[PDB]
Amino acid sequence: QYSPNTQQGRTSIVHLFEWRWVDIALECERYLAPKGFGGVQVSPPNENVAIYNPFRPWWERYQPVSYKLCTRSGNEDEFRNMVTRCNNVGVRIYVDAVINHMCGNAVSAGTSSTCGSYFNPGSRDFPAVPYSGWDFNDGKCKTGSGDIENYNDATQVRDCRLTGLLDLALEKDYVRSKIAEYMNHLIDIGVAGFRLDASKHMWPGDIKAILDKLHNLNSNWFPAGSKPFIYQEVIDLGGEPIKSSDYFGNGRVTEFKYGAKLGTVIRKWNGEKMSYLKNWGEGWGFVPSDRALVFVDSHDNQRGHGAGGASILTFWDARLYKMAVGFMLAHPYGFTRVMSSYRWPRQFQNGNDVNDWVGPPNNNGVIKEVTINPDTTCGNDWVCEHRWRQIRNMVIFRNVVDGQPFTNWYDNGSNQVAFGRGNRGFIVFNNDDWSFSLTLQTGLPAGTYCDVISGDKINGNCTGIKIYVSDDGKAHFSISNSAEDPFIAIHAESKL
Ligand SMILES: *[C@@H]1O[C@H](CO)[C@@H](O)[C@H](O)[C@H]1NC(C)=O
Ligand SMILES: [Ca+2]
Ligand SMILES: [Cl-]
């Protein structure tokens, strides 16, 4: 469960949020594979409720109607096509598995689904699975409203409705089998793993019972005995009866404290400073590195819909965002997930964004295709952070330094820090309100290195800053607090 199953050498996955299968297939071949990305997290591929009020929001995909591979992202044929092409190029696919619940109980019955399947929330009828009233936790939940009312009670958090979402009775073998049937169908198709949505709302034991019914990965692409990569979505900050450590026996867990803390540190909130990142990782109360799935922002908290709140950094904060992502990708802690989003009309009122529901770029509900500009950037309102030079080059940096230890740390007691990874990489950050000019020990072999943040190494030459490492491994770095990107990164493969 704990291994990503990525090709040797690729250390990151990217969340291509709301992308169409056909676009992902193309991206795998034209960019993801050549650039060294390990895999892709896809949006839920199963049929969901079609909400029109508000129009088509992104969260309608977390309200299942059936396990049919039929959504705004494409049909089953297109989905299978994407997995095959991506796998054939060495890029894995990770499915977002929404198995804790079905749609909201207040949703009207009918055929308002992405595939026309009929459903009736009121009577607990989902004939396309099929599921009936006997398959939900309505009789098990003890709250007066039937919804989760108090998170201090670990029992209702697992047996009651998350904001009204019909809760599946995961202790019943029938339900466990229907879910395994769905996941095994995907595994046999070729997916390498899953993101278990709302894992906190499920009993660790119920999850285990389901994982026990899962097949090994497709032997046409994976070595015999390969188990699917499992990362459970558990929002565990401090003070809750439920701990993410309770789920270690099933696979990895999302470390939401990672992005929240990095955000406040980079934003320099509450007296925090980058020099405190010296013991970043478990020393900060995070889960063990071999059980952590980390990220700066997620599709949820990038719009204030999740843990982290206001401190979370996103593409909206481009400058600080690139720095945070750079630090994450350079630091050895956990397995990294890169975010890829779309622009939406952010409309703040009394501190909250009233347009946080807006779905992907579309034409009358039809998701727009991802277009590639001449400068490798995207159009149609897709942000494509994974294509930003500073982020893409750090993705490669992580691959190059994979396995190298954390060393040669340096800090000015404020917001100017630096560190290297063995003798394959070195990175320097300047987040102070003054310039940084100093000679540091990089631990790298002598030579001329191209700064991969400001430029690239293109055929024996650098298109940006050049760093010169002397015989004793020392090198001079100059970063003004006015630089577009206040940090420099160089590695073994950026050496001239
Ligand atoms: C690098 O660029 C210079 C011109 O600025 C050129 O003279 C030199 O031959 C180039 N080297 C390579 C290896 O392309
Ligand atoms: Ca539940
Ligand atoms: Cl997540």
What is the DSSP annotation of 28-51? IIIIIHHHT--EEEEPP-S-BB--
d(CA 322, CA 259): 13
Find out whether 307 and 464 touch, Cβ atoms under 8 Å. Answer: no
Domain positions in the chain are: 2-403, 404-496
CB within 8 A of 155, min separation 6: which ones? 142
User: Which atom of ligand 1 sits closest to the CA of residue 460?
Assistant: 13
- Measured torsion, CA atoms of residues 277, 278, 280, 283, in degrees rounded to the nearest 10: -120
Ligand 1 atom nearest the C-alpha of 461 is 1
Residues 481 and 460 sit within 8 Å (Cβ to Cβ): no
Identify the active-site residue in 197, 297, 300, 385: 197
Residue matched to tokens 């049937």 = 181
Residue 27 catalytic? no
User: How many C-beta neighbours within 10 Å does residue 196 have?
Assistant: 29
Q: Report the residue among 458, 461, 466 best suited for mutation to probe ligand 1: largest number of ligand atoms under 8 A from its CB.
A: 461
What is the crossing angle of helices 173-189 and 204-211, to 10°?
50
**First and final CA of the chain: distance in angstroms?**
40
Scored b (16 or more CB within 10 A) or e, 67-104 reads bbbbbbbbbeebbbbbbbbbbeebbbbbbbbbbbbbbb
For the chain, state the CA radius of gyration: 23
- DSSP letter assigned to residue 268: T
- Beta-carbon contacts of 98 under 8 Å, excluding residues fewer than 6 positions away, are 44, 46, 61, 62, 64, 197, 198
Q: Which residues contact 308 (CB under 8 A, 6 or more apart)?
A: 256, 259, 260, 263, 297, 301
Q: Which CATH number fits domain 404-496: 1.10.3720.10, 3.40.50.2300, 2.60.40.1180, 1.10.40.50?
A: 2.60.40.1180
The two three-digit tokens of residue 16, written as one number: 């291509």
Nearest to 72 by CA among 42, 28, 27, 29: 42
Q: Rounded CA gap, 99 and 203, in Å? A: 12
For residue 275, count other CB atoms closer than 10 A to its CB.
17
**Residue 310: strand, helix, or coil:** helix
Q: Is 494 helix (H, G, I), strand (E, B) or coil?
A: helix
The length of the chain is 496
Q: Reduce the DSSP state of residue 308 to 3 states and report it.
A: coil
Q: Which residue has the tokens 């540190």?
A: 265
Can you point out the beta strands (E) in 278-357?
Answer: 292-294, 335-340, 348-349, 352-353
What are phi and psi for residue 455, nearest 5 degrees? Answer: -150, -150
Q: What share of the chain is helix, strand, coil (3-state, %, to 5)?
A: 30, 25, 45
Identify which of 243, 240, 101, 242 has the alpha carbon closest to the alpha carbon of residue 160: 101
Residues 73 and 18: beta-carbon distance below 8 Å? yes
- Tokens coding 312: 């979370």
In sequence order, the β-bridge partners of residue 367 are 362
Q: Provide the experimental method for this PDB entry.
A: X-ray
- Annotated active-site residue 197? The verdict is yes
Q: Considering only CA atoms, which of 457, 454, 414 is closest in space to residue 436?
A: 414
List the structure tokens of 301: 């908290």
Ligand 1 atom showing the smallest separation from residue 459 Cα? 14
Contacts of 89 (CB under 8 A, 6+ apart): 28, 29, 32, 33
Q: How far is the C-alpha of 210 from the C-alpha of 231, rounded, in Å? A: 14
Helix (H, G, I), strand (E, B) or coil at 264: helix
Q: Taking the CB of residue 27, how many other CB atoms lie within 10 A of it?
A: 27
229-248 exposure pattern, b = at least 16 Cβ within 10 A, e = fewer = bbbbbbbbeeeeebebebbb
DSSP per-residue letters across 74-100: B-HHHHHHHHHHHHHTT-EEEEEE--S
CATH number of this structure's domain 2-403, picked from the four choices 3.40.50.12500, 3.20.20.20, 3.30.450.20, 3.20.20.80: 3.20.20.80
Task: Put the strands of the sheet holding 474-479 in their side by side order.
Answer: 436-441, 474-479, 466-469, 447-450
Residue 182, H or E segment? helix 173-189
State in Å: Cα 107 to ligand 2 middle: 18
